[PDB]
Symmetry: C3
Subunit: 486 residues, 3 copies
């Protein structure tokens, strides 16, 4: 009777702590390495495609952004790195990032007219500019209304809206900053004009800040936009003696989470995924991927490693810690192919290989739970990785980068070793299953047979195909074949 272990036509390599590229009977890849290649829906809900527009361009209504389709509900937003179509009329947007973050995800998001354009009878509401040229005549942000002096009188401008819409509302307004004192008068008549907005929480009065600036889109003026959320049943009151760029529309909101803005140059083509990547979608179950850090969804703890393969089987020797495998049992049996560990008897009747399915199961059973624990215990939530920072937020942006890298180095190390260890342990586990079988036999037979020391036992008597089957059976009978020596 001979003790030995499965061998086979496997070429797969695992790494251990003591040795690299070790060939094993069977392994398992826990690192997803491949992506869809296309941008797709995230839980059925599509993203908001902005093409070459920017969030500011979109919400203000830059005439170049007219051609947009806005599903009242989106899961993520796709914005180019540097959109062409932003503020067509030059200027700035206040707390822009905080707004970008706020409108990460919506459910839903619907535009409503709050201060109808033609209700400004005491003022001119037609001013446009080359900056926002259409076909190509002076035009302006579709959602905003440029109040100018009527004839030669800019009366107190007054507007107000009560949020009876049922959901919080995003409202944006502007303040124009002209090139010189005369442009100021030419447009709004009186200097020392002001724009004053007011809600239960907001209080702000703006005076036009004038300065000689270069030409951006042939404009020296500047429009400084600001925004607020109008709480439900709250009212917002505008009042201006000139220089205000009032809104015509408000935006009904309705959050329920916190997604993110994906920066890509692509264009969704309708697929799916619990996880989307700036490079393509991921379809997987493995505790790790290495595609891209800035994922959006429920994602396999992105690690910085080229591969992660767990040893499940034993070292594959052709022909350890416990001596059996690639040890005193010099080699493996290509012949045995119904299990990992087994016997091979030379009887009165041929034979013959037979795997000990019982101990091969306890191994397949265990090694399975090892693979699963390594996976199933990984924690996974919904998260958007990439955020936005202004040019004067370098430190904050860096703090955030160092934080991401920090967790990247940790999850990499951790995973990279959990593979090394655990392979060194999976292997020595098999080696211990074999040398454990070599003893389940030796300790049944005892002196009824001689121990060849190559894994084989030579019987000091006769063993029919019913005695052999009894040793594997786990039930021998030493108190019988005992009297039967030499």
């Amino acid at each position: 009777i001979c003790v030995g272990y499965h061998s086979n036509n496997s070429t797969e390599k695992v790494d251990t702590i003591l040795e690299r590229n070790v060939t094993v009977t069977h392994a398992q890849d826990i690192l997803e390495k491949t992506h869809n290649g296309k941008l797709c829906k995230l839980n059925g809900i599509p993203p908001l495609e902005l093409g070459d527009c920017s969030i500011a361009g979109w919400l203000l209504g830059n005439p170049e952004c007219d051609r947009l389709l806005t599903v009242p509900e989106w899961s993520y937003i796709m914005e180019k790195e540097n959109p062409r179509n932003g503020l067509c009329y030059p200027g700035s947007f206040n707390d822009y990032e905080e707004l970008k973050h706020l409108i990460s995800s919506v459910t839903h998001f619907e535009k409503v007219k709050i201060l109808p354009k033609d209700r400004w009878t005491q003022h001119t509401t037609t001013g446009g500019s080359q900056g926002c040229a259409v076909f190509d005549n002076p035009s302006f942000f579709r959602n905003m209304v440029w109040l100018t002096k009527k004839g030669s009188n800019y009366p107190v401008a007054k507007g107000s809206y009560n949020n009876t819409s049922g959901e919080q509302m995003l409202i944006i307004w502007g303040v124009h900053h002209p090139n010189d004192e005369t442009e100021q008068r030419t447009l709004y008549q009186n200097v020392g004009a002001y724009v004053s907005v007011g809600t239960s929480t907001l209080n702000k009065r703006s005076l036009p800040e004038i300065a000689t600036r270069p030409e951006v889109n042939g404009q020296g003026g500047r429009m400084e936009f600001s925004w607020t959320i109008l709480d439900i049943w709250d009212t917002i009151n505008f009042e201006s003696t000139g220089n205000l760029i009032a809104p015509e529309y408000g935006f009904k909101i309705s959050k329920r989470g916190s997604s993110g803005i994906m920066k890509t140059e692509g264009t969704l083509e309708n697929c799916e995924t619990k996880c989307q990547t700036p490079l393509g979608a991921i379809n997987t179950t493995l505790p790790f991927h290495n595609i891209h850090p800035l994922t959006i969804g429920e994602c396999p703890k992105y690690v910085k490693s080229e591969r992660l393969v767990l040893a499940t089987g034993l070292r594959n020797v052709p022909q350890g810690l416990f001596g059996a495998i690639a040890g005193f049992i010099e080699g493996g049996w290509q012949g045995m192919v119904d299990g990992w560990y087994g016997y091979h008897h030379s009887n009165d009747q041929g034979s013959g290989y037979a795997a000990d399915k019982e101990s091969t199961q306890k191994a397949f059973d265990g090694i399975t739970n090892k693979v699963n624990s390594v996976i199933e215990k990984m924690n996974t939530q919904f998260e958007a990785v990439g955020k936005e920072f202004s040019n004067l937020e370098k430190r904050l942006e860096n703090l955030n980068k160092k934080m991401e890298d920090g967790f990247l180095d940790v999850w990499t190390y951790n995973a990279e070793l959990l593979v090394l260890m655990e392979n060194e342990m999976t292997l020595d586990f098999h080696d211990s299953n074999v040398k454990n079988l070599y003893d389940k036999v030796r300790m049944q037979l005892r002196d009824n047979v001689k121990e060849l020391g190559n894994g084989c036992f030579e019987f000091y008597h006769k063993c029919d195909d019913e005695c052999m089957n009894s040793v594997k059976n786990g039930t021998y009978d030493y108190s019988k074949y005992e009297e039967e020596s030499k």
Copy 2:
């Protein structure tokens, strides 16, 4: 002589990497799961109970916050999620969070009169409002002084204080923003009024920003409060031609650490703990708890897991890697109950179970250090977990959340596996202690006895209760009982 291992009436389960809910002789819970249920002192030092007041309401002296007891020294602050009693007169508070954070912990904190109310002889110092109604007449923040024009003259208001108090001082001031031009004149006479504060480090001049706003507490006006720390021996100079809401009191400070603000709806009832939780106090020593993230004190690395139990004993088989346990030694001995591993002899004199205390000690010794290392090596400092962010600090707040979650996923995984591994290792350790004893015997006896293969040895001679005791004794005598074939 028979080799075997302890078994007993244990029902406790541990998990390993290869198998779940494995029954073991003895385990150990490292995860604290239960809390005090009440809010208590933290190192003897009590918190600051705010009830339904807010930090702004408290420090400004909202008349509704009059009924407060302020132990000059606190360890943490208890603030409702949304206090009723904040700024009774509507408005805003600048850098409010940065102030909340600053006054996390004090040692001590004492109020001093810095600009006595009645020293404003050239101005009216009695203006109140329905917003801050008392009994219920127009009133105002107890700690602030509302300067209004006297008769019909608002002379230059001038006040100043030199910090001779010995410790840094928190000082708050306001600027009122009226509804219209006339309210402005009605109150402070001259328009274009200003408020200018000055120290060695502070420099600020404010002009009232006016706008038509809705009514909050029946008020259209707004008071915008700001604050500074007055360094020791430095002086602060107020100067106003109207609109100023000067302080009457300053606040002596004195930090020495950085605690936090606990957001609860409870009310301390005098107990203790090195660790308090929004849900109750924790009394423990275990490396982990799962009660609540936002703890205050020195806290067991809060993990997101339902249980963490370490295997200390061996697999409990009634009636492995090394073959002994639940292997060739088919089962355990309910009979043996003075150790983990032992013998059982059938002699000329009854018998009888006897644990090998020596090897049972080396096991109890080792397994103890495993449990301790897992615990004692956990790093633990003082930390407050929850901080505050403004409505325009969404990103910052999210960055901070993703950071906490990040470490939560790590400490969870780490602990969750350290249990799996280390149980798979604690068990195979026992199995190796047994099969190691089976050899400490077999290798003494050799051919002087036969090896039954069930764990038992059958003597090829006589072994009195002094020979048996000699095998356990570790000192046999093969060169004696040798003469007696068989």
Copy 3:
């Protein structure tokens, strides 16, 4: 034949999760602890040497920072803790820390006369102060002009530079806050001065913020500085009806990456490191360290642990899990000193110890990869650890601290255990290599010899120095010496 193991008069005590102190043969170090004391260079480049000058003292031209060596490159920047000479003339610097981080690494840095001082014809260009005394006449930051009135007039000041340098150019202007209205008319002859700076991306007005404040350097006034970065073929623009402090010089700035600022009081010493410290230059390849947390560059991780003793050789007790070492083979052989494991034969010819180099190699081979994996798999990038936060950025600064500590506790724990485990495993590995050799022999000899049970075998026949050599040879011959029983 005896199959004991190596040893030596060593008192190196390693650590395991079961045993506190474990005197062992060979151990390794992984926690580099030593550094120059030289502030060196990073990848070849020098720091910016600053002296008792602050980064603003410098750029502004505080005339105490003449005594300086400014260099067209830097990998970081050495700055004193509390520099001596910064703003001679008291003030504020807007977005200061957001600028420091910007210029913390550059390539290059060039100052260029951009706005010659004379060509201000209409104004005075020779304002100065004893706030800023040189020898010691009145003076002023030697890069700034305090435009004041000429005659009784302050004509509108207008400055313009269309950046033609080809490099982006950081430009810094300032704004004076006179002690009171009349000093204001004294210096600038008209309140309602405003200072307007505008570019393609920046637009700012600002008005004197006069307050009655204390003296800093006997100075009541304050100067407030604010910067920007004028892009290629853009053009910044000035306009002030008073109060401007203008640049005379911008700076060419070419960046390629991040970096930090090192708060030390030393001097760079011409040399080399790849990872700096406020207390010296680390050079190593180990995965960890514990010099200083505030590192700049490619460094090993910083863990809060005293000693990282690994393990590189069996346990020690000259005269485990596998029974051999400090077990049935009672002790080790001072005598054997050409390997870890070996034989010792008493033959017809003396003898004699001989290490089994083959199995001693597989051990030296493996244990090497364990040490290397533990090291070589540590991830290491370039990083500056310490950043700067304003006094009103307490929360942000704390968020960043808790983040560093967070990763410190993790890398400490992780490393602290990886040592415990892995030592418990290195040791039991040796113990398994021995008891594995004891079987490579026993299983060759079988009954041809008796098994003394102390590690030794006694031959039931004759074994010349060619038979002994054959057992170690791995090739015995049981089918020969079989004839010579008892």
